Amino acid sequence: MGVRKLATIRTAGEITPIAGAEAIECCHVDGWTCVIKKGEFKQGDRGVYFEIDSFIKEDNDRYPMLSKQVIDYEGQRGTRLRTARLRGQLSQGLFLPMDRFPELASNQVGDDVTEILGITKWEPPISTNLSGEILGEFPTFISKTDQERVQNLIPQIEENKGQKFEVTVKLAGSSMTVYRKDDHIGVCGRNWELRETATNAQWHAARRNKMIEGLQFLNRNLALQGEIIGESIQGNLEKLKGQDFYLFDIYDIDKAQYLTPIERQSLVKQLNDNGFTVKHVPILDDLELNHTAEQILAMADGPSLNKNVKREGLVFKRLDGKFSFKAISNAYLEKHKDR
Numbered sequence: 125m126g127v128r129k130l131a132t133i134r135t136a137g138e139i140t141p142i143a144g145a146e147a148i149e150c151c152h153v154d155g156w157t158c159v160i161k162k163g164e165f166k167q168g169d170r171g172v173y174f175e176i177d178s179f180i181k182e183d184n185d186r187y188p189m190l191s192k193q194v195i196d197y198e199g200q201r202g203t204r205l206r207t208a209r210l211r212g213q214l215s216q217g218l219f220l221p222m223d224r225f226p227e228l229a230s231n232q233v234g235d236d237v238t239e240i241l242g243i244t245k246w247e248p249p250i251s252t253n254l255s256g257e258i259l260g261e262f263p264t265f266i267s268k269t270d271q272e273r274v275q276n277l278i279p280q281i282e283e284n285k286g287q288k289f290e291v292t293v294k295l296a297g298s299s300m301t302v303y304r305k306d307d308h309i310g311v312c313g314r315n316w317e318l319r320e321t322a323t324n325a326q327w328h329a330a331r332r333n334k335m336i337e338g339l340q341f342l343n344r345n346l347a348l349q350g351e352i353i354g355e356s357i358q359g360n361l362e363k364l365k366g367q368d369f370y371l372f373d374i375y376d377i378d379k380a381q382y383l384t385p386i387e388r389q390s391l392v393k394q395l396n397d398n399g400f401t402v403k404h405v406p407i408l409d410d411l412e413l414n415h416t417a418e419q420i421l422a423m424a425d426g427p428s429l430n431k432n433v434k435r436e437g438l439v440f441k442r443l444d445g446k447f448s449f450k451a452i453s454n455a456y457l458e459k460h461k462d463r
């Protein structure tokens with residue numbers, strides 16, 4: 125991915141009634157489903173769609189329907205959009221008619237108005253031992269690990285029908301990159317490269333599975349990208365003792381592209397055959413893409429790495445390693461509306 129477009133211009137899709145409810149109805153917006161007030165949209169209308177995790181500052185003219193969910197976040201009063209279920213209808217996000225945004229009248233469908241509207245992403249406080257000291261910015265020559273959501277890739281999901289995809293269990297921790305470029309080998313979080321300390325959990329996991337010595341061994345300019353999970357990391361959903369790294373991507377720094385999935389488990393073999401114990405995120409059966417966004421979301425729920433807990437979702441990586449996305453489990457999101 126790259127740059128989250130929390131507020132976008134979109135078109136109302138199919139609009140369907142909600143049984144038992146007379147003042148509301150269900151509106152499809154790309155792969156999302158959203159409860160709207162009767163009489164705000166007809167199919168094909170333009171509107172501003174705010175995704176879940178949007179933080180929308182308090183405003184009684186533009187957002188008067190958001191006033192009974194007002195909280196404090198970073199010192200600002202405002203509303204965090206989260207997954208909900210109204211009259212049995214799953215509802216995600218906020219969809220508002222163009223007439224409430226005259227200043228956006230000239231924007232086109234697909235335009236990102238996040239910064240025009242002052243929208244920010246709500247996020248939990250990060251863990252104490254995953255903050256360490258910084259050596260410098262996240263490397264400009266390594267890609268970051270954000271994935272776009274399948275709900276937003278409707279044209280791309282059939283463009284890629286017939287294509288094949290590696291299917292991996294999405295693990296709930298924090299992103300972690302261990303990389304080599306020539307003489308230097310570094311450990312990063314999701315946003316910063318980190319200097320080694322006794323307490324830093326990223327370095328401690330990297331030392332414990334000898335992935336620094338493994339990168340020296342392989343003698344290539346590679347970024348090993350994976351998730352650090354376990355105790356004291358985003359609630360430790362997998363019920364693990366301690367912390368550990370689970371790989372999900374390898375980035376070829378020199379060719380500035382990701383290793384394809386088969387190239388990646390070959391290297392994970394090789395690393396382990398040589399005593400460098402780097403685990404991988406659980407791998408499921410490949411998928412030959414012939415599906416709708418809603419059918420893909422149906423795959424998302426299921427067993428996690430711990431086969432006794434229900435997983436955050438799945439990540440799909442095309443076998444050429446050049447088109448990837450996540451499908452997050454709505455069951456998971458509904459279970460966790462309180463985090």
Ligand SMILES: *P(=O)(O)OC[C@H]1O[C@@H](n2cnc3c(N)ncnc32)[C@H](O)[C@@H]1O
Nearest residue numbers: 269270292293294295299351372405439
């Ligand atoms: P999440 O909804 O937090 O969005 C993307 C991040 O998920 C993490 N992640 C865990 N497991 C995976 C796999 N298997 N593939 C890709 N990304 C994964 C990363 O830290 C992403 O930044």
